[PDB]
């Protein structure tokens, strides 16, 4: 529940484009603490540090046996995604519409 994850992160599938208006990134976690919280932290092209909305149930990684699903209300324009601590950190460039 508490401190965020320390391991690496890895997307296992499609980053669907739900027509309601969201990206639904599915990931699997290879790391130290297995019942952590997921370090999701979307940002803009510069890093004034935030740009995007988190739509999932406020999720956590409780397995390595189970791929953590994620939903996020991105902005209809160029933008960077992010998942995981500094080393081996997912840095998706969802900068599309």
């Amino acid at each position, epitope marked *: 529940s508490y401190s965020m994850c320390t391991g690496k992160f890895k997307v*296992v599938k499609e980053i669907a484009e739900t027509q309601h208006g969201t990206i639904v990134i599915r990931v699997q976690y290879e790391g130290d603490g297995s019942p952590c919280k997921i370090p999701f932290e979307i940002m803009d092209l510069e890093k004034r540090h935030v740009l995007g909305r988190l739509i999932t149930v406020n999720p956590i990684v409780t397995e390595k*046996d*189970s791929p953590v699903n994620i939903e996020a209300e991105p902005p209809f324009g160029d933008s960077y995604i992010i998942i995981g601590v500094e080393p081996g950190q997912l*840095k998706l460039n969802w900068f599309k519409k």
Partner: antibody
Amino acid sequence: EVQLQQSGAELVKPGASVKLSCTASGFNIKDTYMHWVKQRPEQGLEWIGRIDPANGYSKYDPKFQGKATITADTSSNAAYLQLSSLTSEDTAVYFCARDYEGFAYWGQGTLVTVSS
Amino acid sequence: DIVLTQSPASLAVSLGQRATISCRASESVVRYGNSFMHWYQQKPGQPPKLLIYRASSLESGIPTRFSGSGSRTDFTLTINPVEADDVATYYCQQTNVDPWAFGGGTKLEIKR
């Protein structure tokens, strides 16, 4: 823990079909993509196709679109592989893997020989 | 189509220095801003083993010098402490545009 178990190792007469299969250990099949890579004598691996237990959608490498047909079952935690109308050298160890980013857990290759 | 060029054809390394392998795709593999070039290490009679997933990240639990180096469509695998463990053909595979196929491979030979 985790890992895939393909079935047997059969010998099939030319002009017949085989029904390979991969199975789960500690993860649901809908979890991620699952494939079928083919490998002969020394001609290193050849990705055949991926399938999605979730959607149920599978895309192949054109030049394989006529032989194979990947499948899955959630009842059973397995993804199969129908390879038909085979030829004399349509012979290889047909493997099955897991990920999207680099394949992590592969199964005990299943060798298939087409013979008379 | 999409095409890979793993180039050392077959090399014989020492038992203590930098094993250098390379793979050169034709079209680009930079997907989510991240290039999708992965490596494998298949030994005799066994299935392939994933070294590097995205061009430079090192796997679940694989010995340290094994690392990626690469661009939108041009890469290379490395192993410095080449040891009596690393005897295999190494692979190179793409996962961006559907022909998610692998190269030809390279048969590392370690001297003793």
